[PDB]
Amino acid sequence: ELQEKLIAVNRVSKTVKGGRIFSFTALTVVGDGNGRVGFGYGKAREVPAAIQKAMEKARRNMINVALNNGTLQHPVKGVHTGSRVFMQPASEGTGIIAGGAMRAVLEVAGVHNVLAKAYGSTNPINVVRATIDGLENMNSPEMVAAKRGK
RNA sequence: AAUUGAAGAGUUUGAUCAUGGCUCAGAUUGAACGCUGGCGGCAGGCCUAACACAUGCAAGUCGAACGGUAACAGGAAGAAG
Numbered sequence: 217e218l219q220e221k222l223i224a225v226n227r228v229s230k231t232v233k234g235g236r237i238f239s240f241t242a243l244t245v246v247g248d249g250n251g252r253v254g255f256g257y258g259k260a261r262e263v264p265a266a267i268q269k270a271m272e273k274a275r276r277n278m279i280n281v282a283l284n285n286g287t288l289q290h291p292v293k294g295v296h297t298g299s300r301v302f303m304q305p306a307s308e309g310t311g312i313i314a315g316g317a318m319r320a321v322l323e324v325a326g327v328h329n330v331l332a333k334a335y336g337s338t339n340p341i342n343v344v345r346a347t348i349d350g351l352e353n354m355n356s357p358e359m360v361a362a363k364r365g366k
Numbered sequence: 367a368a369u370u371g372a373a374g375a376g377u378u379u380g381a382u383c384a385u386g387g388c389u390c391a392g393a394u395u396g397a398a399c400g401c402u403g404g405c406g407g408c409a410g411g412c413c414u415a416a417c418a419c420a421u422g423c424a425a426g427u428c429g430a431a432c433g434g435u436a437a438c439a440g441g442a443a444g445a446a447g
């Protein structure tokens with residue numbers, strides 16, 4: 217259950233006396249299929265170095281998520297920079313419908329049957345991220361009683 | 367048992383994030399044109415000039431309301447082929 221996938225890879229330019237010096241960037245997501253997900257950025261002058269350097273970053277920076285079966289307890293909202301995202305339990309029809317990009321975090325992270333949608337900018341670095349934070353804030357379907365109870 | 371269902375992409379920049387229009391993948395059609403065209407079932411077929419119209423047909427029927435015989439069908443005292 218290693219499970220990992222990169223979401224977006226990109227080129228960027230730096231500009232010096234002698235011209236443009238380019239380089240790449242990688243955005244990755246890793247999860248165990250049972251909660252726990254992280255993302256990593258990491259950039260590098262060549263692609264495989266960039267994705268490698270990323271998968272790593274993702275290994276740490278990993279948070280976990282109070283799932284509830286294969287789905288989410290309550291419908292959650294997330295938002296970071298321009299990306300404002302929303303996903304919903306969905307008493308699984310089949311489920312797992314989202315914009316490949318946050319399907320990526322969902323998938324690996326173990327959620328099996330949601331419906332999701334991203335608003336604002338589809339800028340991956342911020343949507344995958346608005347989502348993680350999304351699932352993170354999402355609170356425990358009983359440690360809400362822990363919360364109250366008293 | 368019986369609406370239990372929601373995805374994003376391209377494009378301003380050297381590059382970036384934001385803002386923001388343009389564009390694209392989808393469904394839908396009483397459709398047209400271009401190329402092509404085998405058979406069948408159901409359906410659809412002037413969206414325009416409420417423009418103008420040759421010709422046929424689209425409202426009759428009842429002799430058990432009525433006087434009726436002009437047509438054709440028979441029959442009739444009786445005149446005959």
Ligand SMILES: [Mg+2]
Nearest residue numbers: 378379380381
């Ligand atoms: Mg340019």
Ligand SMILES: [Mg+2]
Nearest residue numbers: 400401402403
């Ligand atoms: Mg032809």
